[PDB]
Amino acid sequence: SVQQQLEALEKSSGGRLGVALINTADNSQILYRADERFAMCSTSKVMAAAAVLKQSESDKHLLNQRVEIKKSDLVNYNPIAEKHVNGTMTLAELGAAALQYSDNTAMNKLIAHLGGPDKVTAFARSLGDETFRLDRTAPTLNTAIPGDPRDTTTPLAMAQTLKNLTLGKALAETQRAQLVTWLKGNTTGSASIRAGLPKSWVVGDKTGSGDYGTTNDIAVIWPENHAPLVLVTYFTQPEQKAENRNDILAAAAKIVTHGF
Numbered sequence: 001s002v003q004q005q006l007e008a009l010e011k012s013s014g015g016r017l018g019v020a021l022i023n024t025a026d027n028s029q030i031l032y033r034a035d036e037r038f039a040m041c042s043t044s045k046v047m048a049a050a051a052v053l054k055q056s057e058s059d060k061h062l063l064n065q066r067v068e069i070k071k072s073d074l075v076n077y078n079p080i081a082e083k084h085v086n087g088t089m090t091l092a093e094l095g096a097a098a099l100q101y102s103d104n105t106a107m108n109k110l111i112a113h114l115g116g117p118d119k120v121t122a123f124a125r126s127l128g129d130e131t132f133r134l135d136r137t138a139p140t141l142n143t144a145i146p147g148d149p150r151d152t153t154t155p156l157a158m159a160q161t162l163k164n165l166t167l168g169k170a171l172a173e174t175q176r177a178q179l180v181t182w183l184k185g186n187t188t189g190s191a192s193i194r195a196g197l198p199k200s201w202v203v204g205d206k207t208g209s210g211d212y213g214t215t216n217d218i219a220v221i222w223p224e225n226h227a228p229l230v231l232v233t234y235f236t237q238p239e240q241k242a243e244n245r246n247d248i249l250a251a252a253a254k255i256v257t258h259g260f
């Protein structure tokens with residue numbers, strides 16, 4: 001069974017695997033540890049970018065608002081923001097950089113604009129997600145310590161919220177479409193969920209990786225002849241310096257989208 005395959009994958013992997021797939025053809029689900037908490041790592045950027053998109057529904061000037069980028073804003077990983085030191089980026093450009101390159105400075109400018117991590121949590125709650133919590137800025141939100149509740153969610157809660165955000169009721173249409181455009185243009189996901197799928201399927205995704213070999217991906221998938229699938233694959237390991245394991249996410253994606 002699919003469940004036996006996921007169990008075996010996890011057993012060989014040397015970690016803890018969390019999967020939630022929602023098949024929007026019939027609202028059926030494939031769940032594996034889907035009610036367990038995992039550190040989101042950079043997959044939490046989706047919620048921060050979406051919270052800014054929600055604000056933009058009522059402020060037609062927001063996405064073009066200039067944000068100053070300073071040398072002191074640079075952190076551990078900021079390939080886009082570092083190009084703009086001494087200049088500005090718009091909030092839209094920060095959304096794009098955060099989502100498509102996983103730029104940590106860009107995430108922090110979104111969080112600061114919103115008024116801190118707790119405001120990102122409040123936005124999740126406004127969408128009916130009782131599980132998501134953002135506690136820290138980047139990059140400390142990626143410490144991913146086993147059993148630490150900070151900066152966590154469950155696979156099922158994140159799959160439900162990602163479905164709502166990208167295909168459902170969370171955002172007004174122009175904002176929904178912008179979020180989907182951003183996710184489809186991600187550059188960091190080739191070896192994760194995408195690698196487990198037919199090459200021709202259209203995918204939007206957001207990765208995350210952190211300590212404890214924590215390796216995550218959240219995706220919306222558009223088959224050629226079928227309704228979309230929403231898939232969350234989270235993975236974490238017992239040792240702090242464990243290597244990240246994108247291949248496990250690809251393997252999980254292949255298992256749960258099989259035959260289909």
Ligand SMILES: *C(=O)[C@@H](NC(=O)/C(=N\OC)c1csc(N)n1)[C@@H]1N=C(C(=O)O)C(=C)CS1
Pocket residue numbers: 041042043076077101102104139140142143188206207208209210211244
């Ligand atoms: C988000 O997950 C974020 N991760 C980090 O900044 C890391 N550590 O922070 C203490 C980290 C550990 S491992 C690794 N490859 N990055 C950024 N997210 C992505 C992503 O997974 O999308 C990275 C590849 C770079 S940094």
